[PDB]
């Protein structure tokens, strides 16, 4: 025989001056590089608000060692970038497959986070165009229009200008930053998803692009990355589509999972329905029942999508999409092999065949609390059809292996170029982020 490395800590308290670290994401690029991203939770392990949380990343190239970590996204003050998701994706450009590594994160202005998030996209739509909202101490609404020029609520121009990094300028002088809690004009205290990308195998990253405008619905309060990774669809009519799992709340503070997706390689995004959205329930107005929260997605051989969801029930809920993430079958069953103690989980597609079948790999804490981290192997079996004739895929969990007997919380899986598996996970102690590699045999023996 078995292969199983001694776990190494890629981030730990004090590293890069940060008190805390959480929320692993893990992706392998087409060059074979492993990318591990993390919340750099500088003021401690606690969620936003009141935490200067940045995006950090470590790289391990094929036949290489872990490069030291660096911060690749850093907002002013204690404005948080929290919960990352990575995605290696490709496009055919003039006969070569060009790789772009996508990363989305959730973003809050200073002072806000999940428990006190306000609602809305953060944007005002004026004649088809979306403009960043700014608020003053008296709760008046302002808009940032062309040239960054700020307009008050009468549609009139003010002496304020907001730069794209939210710096505020009044008559040539800087007067604050709209993400900061002492600024005279403030961005709406609500959740954004922001995206960066890398075209050089994860070494350098773009400036953040906000994905809220024309994507997040005004009734949504929380609207955030489901941490871990997304996937680019390989099979079917939606081949090439980028799919990032997310979740959000409504006015009732009810959490619903979903995916956002892009058919032009990141340029524009659409929101799929939640699995909560059925013929009788609407995720806009639902107020009771099982909440579906953090989630990860895998693809079936025909391009059918399977969304595995943290939820307030005892077991993992799995939803199926026949249209590439736009909607989900109204039956959302539990899988009773997958005890789910209300913790993030990871599920990935495996490139190789196992026992002559296509397979997926799953990890989460297999217990009634965040302990006993287990990695499971599921074989995809075709089994008849749904009411609408669609293929039925089901999962034979052939291996179930404890990789972390004690504490174990959020985790993320990735496949290594040689077919081995990597695992980035919380569980070795406050702010300690561990990475280990292993082969299939290790999962089978035990
Ligand atoms: Ca920062
Ligand atoms: Ca649960």
Numbering used by the authors: 358 to 803
Sentences from the paper on this structure:
Here, we present the structural and biochemical characterization of the GH33 catalytic domains of the three sialidases of C. perfringens and probe their substrate specificity. We report the X-ray crystal structures of these domains in complex with relevant sialic acid variants revealing the molecular basis of how each catalytic domain accommodates different sialic acids.
The structures of NanJGH33 and NanIGH33 were very similar with an RMSD of 1.1 Å and with both proteins containing the same β-sheet domain insertion within the catalytic domain (between residues 477–546 in NanJGH33 and 361–427 in NanIGH33). The inserted domain is not present in NanHGH33 and the RMSD of NanHGH33 with the other two structures is 1.7 Å. The amino acid side chains forming the active site pockets of NanJGH33 and NanIGH33 were identical, though a notable position in a second shell of active site residues showed a tryptophan (W354 in NanIGH33) versus proline (P472 in NanJGH33) difference. In contrast, these loops are relatively minimal in NanIGH33 and NanJGH33, creating a somewhat shallow sialic acid binding site. However, NanI is predicted to be fully secreted while NanJ has a cohesin module that participates in the formation of CAZyme complexes and an FN3 domain that is postulated to mediate attachment to the bacterial cell-surface.
